């Protein structure tokens, strides 16, 4: 239970760059007002055909 | 140039080793022609003879029926357990988003919009900037002035006709920044005073 | 117990196939025989239904020049390579159609070739080609041969006949006659071809009978193309030759020597390993007149000289590949930009193709 | 699901776009404030562009404050809309689907059917003057417009309830992820009995009312992909009933001609009773085209297991005094997950077959159940959803029952993302809940044939 | 192995499993009205007749005989493996769009070996080719090479000029090149490299190459070889296995295709048991030489 | 099991009828069989109690109890007016017909 002044639609981000910037740049990806690992947020990436 | 060259790149493709240095990693099923040293050594040592490469493994063109015989009964469960271990390693390390924060139940990142020391001119125009219905969201959310008393926030909100969702965002932002500031300036932390 | 020529074979599968086909009298129609290829004839194809007139071309590989001779290597390699290779600088193969006897490929029809440009400049008014047009055409042809190089497929045919241009000035190197994919040579090149690209544009490795010629022979052909385009004459307009499986082209080597000069062990490291290197020792010893031969042309010096040095070098280790030739102080340094459309500012129609109706 | 605004979640299957037209007659001063904020909360999440409609005159856009909804004003409004459509001639096909939002002045059935009549009159007067125009109907209660306690964190759900009506109808907000399995289990030589090991199931739920007129149906993939929901008023006759039971199999085979092969459709009869006429129809229509597996489904707790223990379900110590567990998260072990109760279903497979809750002419084989606890402390009955297998195609029916339950849990968890119900029943699969909502709120209208 | 992405194999063939099933169903509905009679099989008179689907369709029973006969003609003529692999690809791509109860199989095999040897730059003249096809099979082949080359013409007609095809062997060479790096530092023994090459050589049966890229087939056969060499206390010992698990996981070559390829190899080695030359050879004999 | 033979579906009806008759006789004449129910003549429970017999596969003859909260209220002489008969649905009690 967070107090209801925690759930703010966050806009001050810094993920206006591209994906695969280096490796494991999830620190600037998981930004919201809940950690994404509280849902088991799995990435999906495959070699396409 | 006029048109872009043919460098033959891949489209969006994961290399065989992402840990490698970024310019000598071989993409899967992907090999363009490039001038190198072994090619000119072959050309130098193999004129007047003709060059062709016999394959690496001796005894090609033979079915593996009497080579891997009992791959059904005795030897399927080992394959199933090894592929289960590969699937588990994949789902638990390669794709799962790691929460690298040990403070609160937010994600890493998520900073509050930063307070700037603003005088009444730029704040007076910024509240008029909020009041329209065509303005952006990122550029406005990148900054918010401080010292905004609640009387002035609610007063200019119901006086300048701010839309409802942006007004709720502004009130929640003032709520959160006051809560974080007052939780910062706390000398004593007893059971009940936090 | 033995078989005859009446056993059960493909026969029923013909019938189920032969009711529903599409012919060259149905999708397209003919206009006029343009005499390009003697071995395989070329025709012009009107689309069968602002004006959007006839702009197609048919190659009809009737090799009998009877009862069903098979496909040739020059047709099989072309049908294997042209159908899947695709670029801005290649002729687009629209369709294959297989008639009662032979094969009918349909590509796009082009406005003119480079040989028609040289023949337009063969009238004795001598409209020497402006350097902007020839350097833009050179850039576009080198990008086309770059795409053809990097996908692991050689190109042992490069003549000004089978290099095209069009309206909007797009160079298309439109003939994969003798190309091959050299990734896994199960049989080497000398055991599979034994002769190469035509006499006026071959390479000194080929003239000295190399059995593992490297992919730089297209670069020598491109340099001969550019020397032809800068002199309005083929640079080595060679003389043809007559138990040895080669006629050796004993006059073409004399021509390419007396234009460029002799080699030795210091401009060519492994010529001693050649089959008939001693057969080069029966000529005189010329120095060069390369800068003099460029001096007997237009005055656009100091940057075509270095490129014609680098391309026309019989050091097949130190020859210059395509992507390292697309920056050689000719397209970065500019006084008018190299575009894709080569016909900007030049406002004349090099006239249309001679159609034998 | 309720964090869908506070995570900027956006649908994977692309956007759908429309143009809106609110059509109210009661209170203009509140719908003027309602329509732009709904269009703005539909634009502000990447769900397409709802460029709301605009006519010539002084009306604020996407609105027409009429009074006395009747024939002449609807005819003039249809003439106005067809004049707009004659104006905007040259455009793409997917830019113009339009929809009409009508406010229910009283959230009942007698005015829902009248607003449906009003929209049908508008579509009839529009279609004959111009074909190929495709407009739709959305209804909203008036209270939800003029209650000032309606949060703007709630319109988001209403926005999703437009996104599941646009003409790409069978592609919705999200579907099941199709993850890798837990155990690999390479299928070698069997054991060699007549076991099948199917590849793609197809779920179907049909029902028939107590009076023998209405037939409701819903069809879904094993991941909730190819959804169809339909209703047929058969009436007193028995030719339209055979026609509807043929069309159900028609749509089922139409979806079946999309997958691999070795495919087993599972048709579930609602409300216990499976009579003989429907069984004669489904035995006539079936064959070697597909393998069926009949299933009887019971929602109401006629058999009532009452739970009485204090120790196992560990939300009960946290609900008893809110300090028993009550501990800190120990935020260096931070690998947790917010697990919402009312969507934590437990599967039961009974030891012996059970009688059906109605129709004492046929018992079952291999009964099972989905069971959802109540978020409270102490002895109380738990909610349940009884599944009863009746006709298995192969042998080893217990494996088929466990596979049916493992598919039914996914089809139950899908029902919140689709706008089918709120967080009130995470135990019922979504197509059975759709059939139950239709046969709960649609049998009461009486029909006349003209 | 120039570039498999943006080639013609990734575009105009190599369809998914539902498209292959739909094309096989269209083939079945094409051959339905051809002969509803069946086959008059006689040995002891004895004349029963199959239903249209009891066997001799394209399910499993003749594919192993097809690969065996292609490989027999191959090692008789002594040409390299890439030509026979391309001939098997032409065989499968022709039998997808045409039935086998109307086409002489041995001429189709010799025709496919001829076309693949011509297009992969290792030519075989028609005289020695049809002489070997006569000296191995004294029946089922006419002395006229013109019938063989008309079969060549219609085979070029059916697979509509899509001749060149990338192979899993090149990607196997690339994988065993990249496994010699400081992230892994492993190398197989030459007997297990031959075992992986033989499994790739064996996987041209069982209808997998029309669905997946070839590097997935290379990774599947190499995984079967490595995990069947590693075991013949701790569970996942012999850290060649551990480095290969980390290579397959850390590289994003995806799963759920390798699973299908390994399961397809298992069902191929299951179907190899109930296989006999007698019934299928006699069925060919009574289907052509009645 | 998947379709009952027509002696088990009669044994169940006989057992249910025996249970409802004995339950009606044991009580003080205050409870009739409504048909798969036993509703009191007075309005004391104001719900339907339903006894459903069943026999399992190992021979465990059990009865299941149900309590349907329908609004079945008994009516009397002081209800035969328009205000009650206009908006109620009547039912014959020991059979279940309307």
| Feature table: binding site of C | 34-42, 59
Dist. CA C122–CA D389, nearest whole Å? 91
Stretch 38-97 of chain F: residues touching chain D, C-beta under 8 Å: 52, 54, 56-58, 64, 66
Phi, psi of E136 (to 5 degrees): -90, -45
Q: What is the DSSP string of C27-78?
A: SEEEEEEE---SSSEEEEEEEP-------EEEEEE-TT--------HHHHHH
Among chain C residues, CA nearest to E166:
C183
Instruction: Provide the 8-state DSSP code for B91.
Output: I
Contact status of C269 with chain E (Cβ, < 8 Å): no
Beta-strand relationship, D228-233 and D214-221? antiparallel
- Buried residues in E115-149 as b, exposed as e (16+ CB within 10 A): bbbbbbbbbbebeebbebbbeebeebbbeebebbb
D98 DSSP β-pair partners: D19, D135
Q: Write the residue in E212, E252, E257 that is nearest to A45 by C-beta.
A: E252
Token look-up 């065509």 returns B134
Measure the N-to-C terminal CA separation of chain B; round to a whole number of Å: 65
Beta strands in C84-215 (DSSP E): 95-98, 103-108, 112-113, 164-165
Looking at C282-357, list the stretches that DSSP marks H as alpha helix, in order from N- to C-terminal side.
290-295, 304-311
Apex C148 CA angle, C147 and C149, nearest 5: 90
D and E touch with 3+ CB pairs <8 Å, answer yes
Name the nearest CA neighbour of D381 among D315, D271, D313, D301.
Answer: D301
Instruction: Provide the 8-state DSSP code for C352.
Output: P
Dist. CA E285–CA E140, nearest whole Å? 9
Rg of chain F in Å (alpha carbons): 16
- Buried residues in D48-74 as b, exposed as e (16+ CB within 10 A): bebebbebeeeeebbbbbeeebeeeeb
Q: Write the residue in A8, A13, A30 that is nearest to B97 by C-beta.
A: A30
Dist. CA E227–CA E243, nearest whole Å? 12
Cβ of A42 within 8 Å of Cβ of B95? The answer is yes
The helix or strand, by DSSP H or E, that contains position D242, with its residue range, turns out to be: helix D239-256
Contact C29, C45 (CB under 8 A): yes
Cβ of A46 within 8 Å of Cβ of E252? The answer is yes
Q: How close, in Å, is residue E38 to chain C by CA atoms?
A: 16
Cβ of A49 within 8 Å of Cβ of E253? The answer is no
Q: Write the residue in F1, F9, F58 that is nearest to D361 by C-beta.
A: F9
> CA dist D265 to C19, D148, D288, D399, E220, Å?
41, 48, 12, 16, 33
Contact D101, D136 (CB under 8 A): no
Contact status of D446 with chain E (Cβ, < 8 Å): no
| Nearest 10 degrees: Cα torsion C151, C155, C158, C163 | -40
- Buried residues in D265-287 as b, exposed as e (16+ CB within 10 A): bbbbbbbbbbeeebbebbeebbe
Instruction: Provide the 8-state DSSP code for A5.
Output: T
Dist. CA B34–CA D361, nearest whole Å? 79
Measure the N-to-C terminal CA separation of chain C; round to a whole number of Å: 57
Q: What is the largest CA-CA distance in chain C?
A: 81
Q: Which residues contact A13 (CB under 8 A, 6 or more apart)?
A: A28, A31, B109
Q: What is the DSSP string of D254-308?
A: HHHTTS-SSEEEEEEESSS---HHHHHHHHHH-SSSSEE-EEEEE-S-SS-PEE-
Rg of chain A in Å (alpha carbons): 14
Q: Which residues contact D7 (CB under 8 A, 6 or more apart)?
A: A32, A34
Q: Which two tokens stand for residue C214?
A: 């490297």
Contact D100, D53 (CB under 8 A): no
Q: What is the DSSP string of chain E?
A: --BSTTSSTTTTS---HHHHHHHHHHHHHHHHTT-SS--------------TTSSSSSSSTTHHHHHHHHHHHHHHHT--HHHHHHHHHHHHHHHHHS-SSSS-HHHHHHHHHHHHHHHTT----HHHHHHHHHHH-SSS--S-HHHHHHHHHHHHHHTTS------HHHHHHHHHHHTSSTTT-----HHHHHHHHHHHHHTTSSS-TTTS-HHHHHHHHHHHHHHHHH----SS-STHHHHHHHHHHHS---SSSHHHHHHHHHHHHHHTTS--HHHHHHHHHHHH--
Dist. CA C301–CA C294, nearest whole Å? 8
Token look-up 């048919």 returns C58
Q: How close, in Å, is residue E80 to chain C by CA atoms?
A: 8
Q: Write the residue in E18, E255, E259 that is nearest to D258 by C-beta.
A: E18
- Which site among D296, D352, D355, D386 would you substitute to test the F interface, given the most F Cβ atoms closer than 10 Å to its Cβ? D355
Dist. CA C264–CA D329, nearest whole Å? 82
Dist. CA B16–CA E178, nearest whole Å? 8
Cβ of C273 within 8 Å of Cβ of B47? The answer is yes
- The number of residues in chain B equals 194
Apex F41 CA angle, F37 and F47, nearest 5: 45
| Feature table: binding site of C for ATP | 34-42, 59
Numbers of helices and strands, H then E, in chain B: 6, 2
Q: Which two tokens stand for residue D217?
A: 């149906």
Entry resolution (Å): 4.4
Numbers of helices and strands, H then E, in chain F: 2, 4
> CA dist A33 to A10, B115, D8, Å?
7, 19, 11
| Nearest 10 degrees: Cα torsion F80, F83, F86, F90 | -50
Looking at chain F, list the stretches that DSSP marks H as alpha helix, in order from N- to C-terminal side.
8-26, 82-85
Binding partners of C (≥3 Cβ pairs within 8 A): B, E
B and E touch with 3+ CB pairs <8 Å, answer yes
Cβ of C9 within 8 Å of Cβ of E104? The answer is yes
Looking at chain B, list the stretches that DSSP marks H as alpha helix, in order from N- to C-terminal side.
37-45, 77-89, 120-130, 138-141, 150-160, 164-184
Cβ of A31 within 8 Å of Cβ of B14? The answer is no
- Which site among A30, A33, A41 would you substitute to test the B interface, given the most B Cβ atoms closer than 10 Å to its Cβ? A30
Contact D372, D344 (CB under 8 A): yes
Q: Which two tokens stand for residue E8?
A: 């013609």
In chain E, which residues have their Cβ closer than 8 Å to the Cβ of A46? Answer: 252, 254
Q: Which residues contact D330 (CB under 8 A, 6 or more apart)?
A: none
Using left for φ > 0, alpha for ψ between -120 and 50, and beta otherwise, residue C164 falls in beta
Q: How close, in Å, is residue A34 to chain B by CA atoms?
A: 4
Give the range of the structural domain holding residue C313, as residue numbers without chain letter. Answer: 110-357
Dist. CA E218–CA D411, nearest whole Å? 37
Name the nearest CA neighbour of D403 among D222, D252, D226, D268.
Answer: D222
Token look-up 């003879």 returns B49
Q: Which two tokens stand for residue D72?
A: 């002449």
- The number of residues in chain A equals 49
Binding partners of B (≥3 Cβ pairs within 8 A): A, C, D, E
Q: How close, in Å, is residue B165 to chain D by CA atoms?
A: 7
In chain A, which residues have their Cβ closer than 8 Å to the Cβ of B101? Answer: 35
Q: Which two tokens stand for residue B55?
A: 């394959």
Q: What is the DSSP string of B118-159?
A: --HHHHHHHHHHHTSSS--SHHHHT-EES---HHHHHHHHHH
Q: Write the residue in E1, E190, E258 that is nearest to B57 by C-beta.
A: E190
In chain F, which residues have their Cβ closer than 8 Å to the Cβ of D358? Answer: none
Dist. CA D211–CA D271, nearest whole Å? 13
Q: How close, in Å, is residue F9 to chain D by CA atoms?
A: 6
The helix or strand, by DSSP H or E, that contains position A18, with its residue range, turns out to be: none
Name the nearest CA neighbour of E165 among E265, E221, E224, E84.
Answer: E84
Dist. CA D24–CA D28, nearest whole Å? 7
Contact B130, B165 (CB under 8 A): no
Instruction: Provide the 8-state DSSP code for B90.
Output: I
> CA dist B94 to D334, E38, E252, E254, Å?
18, 55, 9, 12
Cβ of E21 within 8 Å of Cβ of D187? The answer is no
C157 counts as catalytic: yes
Q: What is the DSSP string of C211-268?
A: SS--TTHHHHHHHHHHHHHHHTS-TT--------S--TTTTHHHHHHHHH----TTT-
Dist. CA D300–CA D383, nearest whole Å? 9
From the number of C-beta atoms within 10 Å of its C-beta (0-12, 13-18, 19+), residue A26 rates as buried
Name the nearest CA neighbour of C140 among C326, C307, C302, C309.
Answer: C326
CB atoms within 10 A of CB D318: 13
Percent helix / strand / coil, chain C, rounded to 5: 25, 10, 65
Q: Write the residue in D303, D362, D391 that is nearest to F4 by C-beta.
A: D362
Q: Which residues contact C234 (CB under 8 A, 6 or more apart)?
A: C200, C201, C224, C228
Dist. CA B88–CA D438, nearest whole Å? 43
Cβ of A8 within 8 Å of Cβ of D338? The answer is no
Cβ of D260 within 8 Å of Cβ of E267? The answer is no
Phi, psi of C73 (to 5 degrees): -65, -35
What angle, 0 to 180 degrees and rounded to 10, lies between the N-to-C axes of helices C217-231 and C131-150? 170
Reported for D401-408, long-range contacts at CB under 8 A and 24+ positions apart, including other chains, are D401/D349, D401/D366, D401/D368, D402/D347, D402/D349, D402/D368, D403/D201, D404/D266, D404/D293, D404/D295, D404/D368, D405/D347, D405/D349, D405/D368, D405/D370, D406/D347, D407/D201, D407/D203, D407/D222, D408/D370
Handedness of CA E187, E189, E192, E194 (dihedral sign): positive
Contact C308, C220 (CB under 8 A): no
Instruction: Provide the 8-state DSSP code for D60.
Output: P
Residue ranges of chain A whose CB lies within 8 Å of a chain D CB: 7-9, 32-35, 37-40
Dist. CA D403–CA D196, nearest whole Å? 13
What angle, 0 to 180 degrees and rounded to 10, lies between the N-to-C axes of helices D397-413 and D430-441? 70
Name the nearest CA neighbour of E115 among E147, E158, E83, E141.
Answer: E83
User: Which of C113, C143, C157, C175 does the annotation list as catalytic?
Assistant: C157
E and F touch with 3+ CB pairs <8 Å, answer no
Phi, psi of D101 (to 5 degrees): -100, 125
From the number of C-beta atoms within 10 Å of its C-beta (0-12, 13-18, 19+), residue B79 rates as buried
Handedness of CA B146, B152, B156, B157 (dihedral sign): positive
Phi, psi of F51 (to 5 degrees): -100, 120
Name the nearest CA neighbour of B170 among B186, B155, B189, B190.
Answer: B155
What's CA A40's distance to the chain center, in Å? 12
Q: Write the residue in E4, E262, E266 that is nearest to B29 by C-beta.
A: E4
Apex E173 CA angle, E167 and E176, nearest 5: 140
Cβ of E123 within 8 Å of Cβ of C73? The answer is yes
CB atoms within 10 A of CB F17: 11
Contact A32, A10 (CB under 8 A): yes
Contact C72, C63 (CB under 8 A): yes
Q: Which residues contact E8 (CB under 8 A, 6 or more apart)?
A: C83, C84, E162, E164
Helix (H/G/I), strand (E/B), else coil: B116? strand
Beta-strand relationship, B144-145 and B115-116? parallel
Contact status of C146 with chain B (Cβ, < 8 Å): yes
Cβ of B83 within 8 Å of Cβ of D335? The answer is no
Q: Write the residue in B6, B43, B50 that is nearest to C146 by C-beta.
A: B6
Rg of chain C in Å (alpha carbons): 23
Looking at D111-224, list the stretches that DSSP marks H as alpha helix, in order from N- to C-terminal side.
112-127, 142-146, 155-163
Beta-strand relationship, C56-61 and C103-108? antiparallel
Q: Which residues contact B188 (CB under 8 A, 6 or more apart)?
A: none
Handedness of CA D260, D261, D267, D268 (dihedral sign): negative
In chain B, which residues have their Cβ closer than 8 Å to the Cβ of E236? Answer: 82, 85
Token look-up 């047709």 returns C75
Contact C115, C161 (CB under 8 A): yes
Among chain E residues, CA nearest to B79:
E227
| Nearest 10 degrees: Cα torsion E80, E81, E86, E89 | 150
Dist. CA C77–CA C99, nearest whole Å? 19
- Which site among E120, E194, E262 would you substitute to test the B interface, given the most B Cβ atoms closer than 10 Å to its Cβ? E194
CB atoms within 10 A of CB C337: 11
B and F touch with 3+ CB pairs <8 Å, answer no
Q: What is the DSSP string of E179-245?
A: TSSTTT-----HHHHHHHHHHHHHTTSSS-TTTS-HHHHHHHHHHHHHHHHH----SS-STHHHHHH
Contact B91, E249 (CB under 8 A): no
Among chain B residues, CA nearest to C152:
B33
Dist. CA C219–CA C216, nearest whole Å? 5
In chain C, which residues have their Cβ closer than 8 Å to the Cβ of B50? Answer: 188-191, 211-212
Dist. CA C6–CA B163, nearest whole Å? 89
Q: Which two tokens stand for residue E54?
A: 């009891």
Helix (H/G/I), strand (E/B), else coil: F22? helix
Q: Which approach determined this entry?
A: cryo-EM
Binding partners of F (≥3 Cβ pairs within 8 A): D
């Amino acid at each position: 239970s967070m107090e209801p002044y925690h759930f703010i639609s966050n806009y001050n981000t810094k993920y206006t760059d591209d994906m695969a910037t280096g490796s494991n740049d999830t620190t600037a990806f998981n930004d919201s007002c809940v950690n994404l690992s509280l849902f088991d947020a799995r990435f999906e990436r495959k070699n396409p055909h | 140039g006029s048109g872009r060259y043919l460098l033959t790149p891949p489209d969006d493709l994961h290399p065989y080793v992402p840990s490698s240095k970024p310019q000598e990693q071989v993409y899967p099923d992907f090999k363009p022609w490039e001038h190198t040293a072994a090619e000119d050594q072959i050309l130098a040592n193999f004129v007047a003879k003709g060059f062709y490469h016999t394959p690496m493994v001796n005894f090609e063109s033979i079915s593996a029926r009497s080579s891997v015989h009992e791959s059904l009964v005795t030897q399927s469960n080992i394959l199933s357990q090894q592929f289960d271990k590969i699937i588990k390693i994949r789902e638990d390390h390669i794709n799962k988003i790691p929460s690298n924060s040990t403070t609160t139940l937010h994600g890493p990142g998520f900073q509050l919009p930063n307070r700037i020391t603003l005088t009444d001119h730029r704040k007076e125009t910024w509240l008029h900037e909020l009041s329209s219905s065509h303005t952006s969201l990122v550029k406005i959310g990148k900054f918010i002035p401080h010292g905004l008393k609640r009387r002035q926030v609610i007063e200019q909100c119901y006086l300048k006709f701010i839309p409802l969702k942006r007004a709720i965002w502004l009130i929640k932002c003032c709520y959160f920044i006051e809560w974080k500031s007052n939780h910062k300036k706390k000398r004593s932390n007893a059971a009940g005073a936090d | 117990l033995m078989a005859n020529n009446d056993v059960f074979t493909i026969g029923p599968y013909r019938a189920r196939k032969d009711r529903m086909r599409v012919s060259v009298l149905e999708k397209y129609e003919v206009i006029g025989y343009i005499a390009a290829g003697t071995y395989g004839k070329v025709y012009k194809a009107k689309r069968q239904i602002k004006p959007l007139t006839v702009f197609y071309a048919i190659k009809k590989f009737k090799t009998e020049k009877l009862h069903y001779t098979g496909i040739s290597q020059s047709a099989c390699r072309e049908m294997a390579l042209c159908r899947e290779l695709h670029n801005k600088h290649l002729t687009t193969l629209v369709e294959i159609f297989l008639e009662r006897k032979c094969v009918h490929m349909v590509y796009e029809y082009a406005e003119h070739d480079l040989l028609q440009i040289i023949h337009f400049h063969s009238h004795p008014e001598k409209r020497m080609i402006p350097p902007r047009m020839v350097r833009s055409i050179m850039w576009q042809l080198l990008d086309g041969v770059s795409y053809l190089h990097q996908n692991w497929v050689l190109h042992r045919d490069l003549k000004p006949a089978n290099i095209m241009v069009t309206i909007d000035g797009c160079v298309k190197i439109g003939d994969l006659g003798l190309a091959r994919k050299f990734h896994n040579m199960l049989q080497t090149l000398y055991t599979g071809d034994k002769v190469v690209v035509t006499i006026w544009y071959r390479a000194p490795e080929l003239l000295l009978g190399a059995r593992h010629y490297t992919p730089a022979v297209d670069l020598w052909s491109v340099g001969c193309i550019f020397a032809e385009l800068i002199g309005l004459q083929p640079i080595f307009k060679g003389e043809e030759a007559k138990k040895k499986t080669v006629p050796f082209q004993v006059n073409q080597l004399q021509r390419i020597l007396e234009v460029l000069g002799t080699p030795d062990q210091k401009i060519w490291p492994y010529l001693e390993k050649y089959p008939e290197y001693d057969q080069i020792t029966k000529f005189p010893k010329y120095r060069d007149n390369l800068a003099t031969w460029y001096h007997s042309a237009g005055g656009r010096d100091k940057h075509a000289l270095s490129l014609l040095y680098h391309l026309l070098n019989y050091d097949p280790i130190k020859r210059i590949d395509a992507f390292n030739a697309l920056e050689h102080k000719y397209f970065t340094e500019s006084d008018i930009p190299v575009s894709e459309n080569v016909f900007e500012g030049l406002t004349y129609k090099y006239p249309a193709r001679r159609i034998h109706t | 699901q309720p964090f869908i605004k506070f995570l900027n979640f956006r649908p994977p299957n692309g956007i759908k776009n429309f143009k809106s037209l609110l059509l109210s007659s009661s209170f203009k001063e509140d719908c003027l404030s309602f329509a732009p904020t709904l269009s703005q909360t539909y634009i502000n999440q990447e769900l397409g562009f709802c460029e709301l409609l605009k006519l010539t005159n002084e009306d604020p856009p996407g609105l027409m404050y009429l009074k006395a909804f009747d024939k002449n004003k609807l005819l003039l409004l249809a003439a106005q809309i067809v004049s707009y459509c004659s104006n905007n001639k040259n455009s793409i096909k997917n830019v113009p689907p339009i929809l009409i939002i009508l406010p229910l002045d009283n959230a009942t059935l007698t005015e829902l059917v009248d607003k449906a009549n009003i929209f049908q009159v508008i579509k009839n007067e529009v279609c004959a003057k111009m074909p190929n125009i495709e407009l739709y109907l959305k209804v909203i209660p008036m209270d939800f417009i003029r209650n000032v306690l309606v949060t703007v964190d709630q319109y988001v759900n209403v926005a999703i309830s437009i996104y599941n009506m646009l003409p790409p109808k069978s592609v919705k907000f999200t579907h099941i992820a199709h993850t890798l399995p837990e155990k690999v289990n390479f299928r070698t030589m069997q054991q060699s009995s007549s076991i099948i090991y199917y590849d793609s199931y197809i779920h179907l739920a049909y029902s028939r009312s107590v009076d023998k007129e209405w037939v409701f149906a819903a069809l879904s993939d094993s991941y909730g992909q190819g959804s169809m929901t339909k209703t047929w008023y058969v009436g007193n006759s028995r030719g339209k009933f055979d026609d509807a039971c043929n069309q159900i199999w028609n749509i089922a085979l139409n979806l079946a001609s999309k997958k691999f092969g070795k495919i087993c459709l599972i048709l579930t009869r609602l409300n216990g009773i499976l009579p003989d006429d429907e069984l004669m129809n489904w035995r006539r229509l079936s064959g070697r085209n597909i393998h069926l597996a009949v299933v009887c489904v019971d929602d109401n707790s006629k058999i009532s297991f009452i739970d009485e223990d204090k120790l196992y379900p560990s939300f009960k110590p946290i609900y008893k005094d809110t300090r028993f567990g009550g501990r800190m998260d120990m935020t260096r072990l931070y690998d947790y997950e917010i697990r919402d109760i009312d969507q934590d279903i437990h599967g039961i497979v009974f030891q012996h077959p059970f009688p059906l809750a109605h129709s004492q002419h046929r018992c079952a084989i291999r009964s099972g159940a989905l069971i959802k606890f109540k978020k409270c402390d102490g002895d109380t009955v738990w909610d349940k959803f009884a599944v009863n297998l009746l006709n298995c195609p192969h042998s080893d029916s217990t494996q088929l029952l466990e596979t049916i339950l493992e598919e039914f849990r996914n089809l139950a968890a899908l029902n919140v993302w689709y706008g089918l119900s709120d967080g009130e029943d995470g135990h019922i699969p979504w197509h059975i809940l759709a059939v139950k909502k239709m046969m709960n709120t649609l049998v009461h209208t009486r029909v006349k044939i003209a | 192995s120039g570039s498999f992405w943006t080639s013609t194999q990734r575009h105009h063939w190599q369809y998914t499993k539902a498209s292959l099933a739909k094309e096989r169903q269209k083939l079945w509905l094409l051959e339905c009205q051809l002969f509803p009679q069946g086959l008059n099989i006689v040995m002891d008179k004895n004349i029963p007749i199959t239903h249209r689907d009891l066997h001799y369709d394209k399910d499993y029973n003749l594919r192993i005989y097809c690969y065996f006969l292609i490989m027999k003609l191959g090692r008789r003529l002594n040409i390299r493996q890439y030509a026979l692999a391309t001939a098997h690809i032409y065989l499968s791509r022709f039998l997808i769009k045409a039935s086998v109860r109307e086409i002489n199989l041995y001429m189709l095999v010799t025709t496919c070996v001829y076309l693949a040897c011509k297009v992969e730059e290792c030519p075989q003249y028609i005289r020695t080719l049809v002489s070997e096809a006569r000296t191995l099979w004294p029946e089922f082949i006419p002395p006229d090479p013109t019938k063989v080359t008309e079969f060549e013409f219609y085979l070029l007609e059916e697979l509509e000029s899509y001749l060149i095809v990338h192979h899993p062997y090149q990607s196997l060479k690339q994988i065993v090149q990249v496994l010699k790096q400081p992230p892994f530092q492993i190398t197989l023994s030459s007997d297990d490299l031959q075992n992986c090459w033989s499994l790739i050589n064996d996987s041209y049966i069982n209808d997998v190459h029309l669905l997946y890229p070839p590097h997935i087939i290379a990774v599947a056969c190499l995984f079967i070889t490595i995990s069947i060499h590693g075991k013949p206390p701790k569970n996942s010992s012999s850290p060649v296995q551990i480095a290969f698990n980390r290579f397959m996981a850390e590289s994003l070559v995806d799963l759920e295709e390798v699973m299908d390829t390994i399961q397809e190899q298992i069902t191929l080695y299951d179907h190899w048991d109930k296989y006999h030359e007698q019934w299928i050879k006699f069925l060919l004999h009574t289907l052509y030489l009645r | 099991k998947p379709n009952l033979p027509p002696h088990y579906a009669l044994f169940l009806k006989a057992l249910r009828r025996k249970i409802y008759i004995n339950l009606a006789l044991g009580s003080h004449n205050k409870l009739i069989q409504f048909g798969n129910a036993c509703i009191s003549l007075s309005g004391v429970p104001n719900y339907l109690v339903q006894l459903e017999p069943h026999l399992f596969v190992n021979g465990d003859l059990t009865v299941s109890l149900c309590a349907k909260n329908m609004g079945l209220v008994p009516m009397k002489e002081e209800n035969l007016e328009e205000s009650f008969l206009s908006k109620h649905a009547l039912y014959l009690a020991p059979s279940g017909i309307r």
